[PDB]
Structure formats: C-alpha cells, structure tokens
C-alpha cells in the first residue's frame, strides 16, 4: 500500500508540555484527541480554535478555576489570571457527548502548560471536570477503553464514580487495560506530569 495510514505507535505521542492525549468518543469508532495548549506570559485572555462549541470554553474556565484554587500545590504562578493567556487547540470541532468532551484532560493540560512540565505518555485520560475539582462520572467508557487499547495505551485513569462500570464491561477489555480511580483533579495532576510537582 505504501505510507502507513496512521502515525507510528508511540511516535505521534511524545512526552511534551502542551500536548494532551485525551480519549474521545465518536459515533463510528472511538478515537483519541491530541489536545494542544499554548501558555506563555500574557494578560489573561482565553483563546479557542477548531470550530469548537462553546462548552469547551466553560470547561477551560472550570480548569482555570481549579488551578486558581490549588495554585501553590505545584508551583504555578501566584498571580497568573492577569499575566498569562491560554490558547487551546482541539483537533476536532466538538463531540456528540453532551457536556465537556474531556474536562480533566484539558485541566491537566492547562496545568502542565502553566507549569511547563511535560505530560506523561503511555497514559490516556478522559473525564468531565467540575468547578469543585470533582471528576463526575462519564458515560460511554466502552469505546473510550477500546480506542485507548487501539491507541497502544494500557494505563487509562477514569473517574472514581465510574468504578461500577468496571463490573459491567466484558473482562476481555477490563483486564487488558490498567485503570485507576480518581475523584479530584489534583489526584490526576500528579499522574499526568513528568515531575511530582
């Protein structure tokens, strides 16, 4: 055939700061979104690209809210809401999944961008962020885990309240992928960053 259809495994995914390999849901087979964010010193203006629906803007605002609450836990700038702009790029427009496509993914991506600390690969994370830092359970985790296995990633952290879904899916999928239970975005902050802080 010639050129491979997709980029080589673990080649398109490298440990970087602005990248965010977040699981996504699509009607004709799940995929994974490489979310990119640009955070270098500015004035606090928010930017979105990719024919996005507005719901991602509130998800980003919730992410900024959470960062403004636990800023000093990881060395983030003391007064950054008035000194740094955020420019987020999403490879697709929006997902049919109502609410944010992946809230904790964007929150951790923006936290990494502000901290300028590379995000770990070999882990794909999806879930909806809340202003109180609570990872609300997400539906349709089946295709999420299927695409994650197709992504070559075995470590997939999921919302804590989705733990019951870890008993309804077939064992052919659950056992092949490592799963952690999380409820606070601060928990996955240490699990999607190269350094502990």
């Amino acid at each position: 055939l010639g050129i491979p259809r997709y980029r080589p495994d673990k080649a398109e995914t490298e440990p970087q700061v602005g990248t965010a390999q977040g699981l996504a849901w699509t009607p004709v087979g799940g995929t994974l979104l490489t979310i990119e964010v640009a955070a270098v010193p500015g004035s606090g203006k928010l930017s979105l690209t990719g024919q996005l629906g507005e719901v991602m803007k509130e998800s980003a605002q919730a992410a900024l809210t959470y960062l403004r609450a636990h800023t000093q836990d990881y060395g983030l700038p003391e007064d950054f809401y008035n000194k740094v702009d955020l420019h987020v790029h999403v490879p697709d427009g929006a997902t049919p999944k109502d609410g944010p496509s992946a809230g904790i993914t964007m929150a951790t991506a923006i936290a990494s961008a502000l901290s300028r600390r590379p995000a770990r690969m070999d882990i794909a994370m999806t879930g909806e962020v809340s202003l109180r830092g609570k990872v609300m359970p997400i539906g349709g985790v089946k295709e999420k885990l299927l695409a994650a296995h197709q992504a070559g990633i075995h470590k997939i952290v999921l919302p804590k309240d989705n733990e019951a879904q870890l008993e309804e899916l077939p064992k052919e999928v659950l056992e092949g992928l490592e799963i952690k239970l999380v409820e606070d975005v601060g928990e996955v902050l240490e699990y999607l960053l190269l350094p502990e802080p």
Binding site: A38, V40, K45, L46, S47, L48, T49, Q51, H89
Partner: protein, 144 residues
C-alpha cells in the same frame, strides 16, 4: 512584495497581496454570521475567491499589526493557518467548511518582529532585510 513577485516568478504561480495592518477585529479576519444582507467572510477567504487556483503564492502585509480588544487573539486563527495539515481546520463564520489552505504557500511580512502576536512567535524565521548604503542605492537606482 518584490521578493514575493520574484518567488512567484520562480514557482510560476499566481501572486497576491492582502493588507493585515490596522485590523482590530477577529471578525475582520474571520467571517461574519449569516445575520444580515450580504454577510461577508474574512479577508483571506475573499482573497482566495479572487484567485482561481488552490496553490498560489500569497503574501501577507504587516501581520505584526494585529489587534483585539476582547478575549482571543488573531494569532490563533493565523496559527491554524500556519500548519498546512491544520489549514484544513480553517476558522470560518460565513462559510462553515474549513478551506484547504495546505497548498496555498504562505509568505509573511512584518515590519516589526517584536510586535508580531506572540502566539505566532513560534515557527518564525526572521530574514532581516537590512538597510541600504549610498553606493547600494546608487546601484539599484542605475539598475532597477
């Protein structure tokens, strides 16, 4: 723009220039919603409408003179423009189909590098065109 003409003579494509200075609105570079008679797209879209080929030589004019008084920067749309594979994700408001600006070879112009919008500061190669001497000006006068 003479360098643009020379480049388009080399590639034998069609050359064009569009002004970008004095732009204060994102809706000036992006399109407008279908909310009035004769809703208009962005400047780049209509400039493409001027051309008839999807791989011309196109030139920007003072990209460093962007402006926006509300959230978001014009550098975001221009960054979408930067990557030819991301060009297929073109922002639009009159049309909704992202155009394929991948084959549209973009060459840029900014009289001041430090006023270029800092989201567009990555992936810039400052080809600093220098000033000209008395003898150099004499020569280019006697020749061009």
């Amino acid at each position: 723009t003479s360098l643009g003409r020379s480049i388009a003579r080399s590639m034998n494509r069609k050359f064009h220039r569009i002004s970008l200075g004095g732009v204060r609105d994102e809706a000036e570079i992006r399109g407008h919603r279908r909310t009035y008679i004769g809703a208009m797209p962005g400047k780049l879209i209509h400039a493409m409408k001027q051309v008839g080929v999807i791989n011309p030589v196109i030139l920007l004019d003072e990209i460093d003179k962007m402006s926006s008084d509300w959230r978001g920067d014009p550098a975001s749309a221009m960054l979408e423009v930067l990557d030819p594979e991301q060009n297929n994700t073109f922002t639009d408001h009159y049309l909704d189909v992202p155009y394929d600006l991948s084959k549209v070879f973009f060459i840029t112009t900014a009289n001041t590098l430090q006023t270029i919008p800092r989201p567009l500061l990555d992936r810039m190669e400052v080809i600093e065109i220098p000033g000209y001497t008395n003898m150099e000006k004499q020569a280019i006068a006697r020749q061009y």
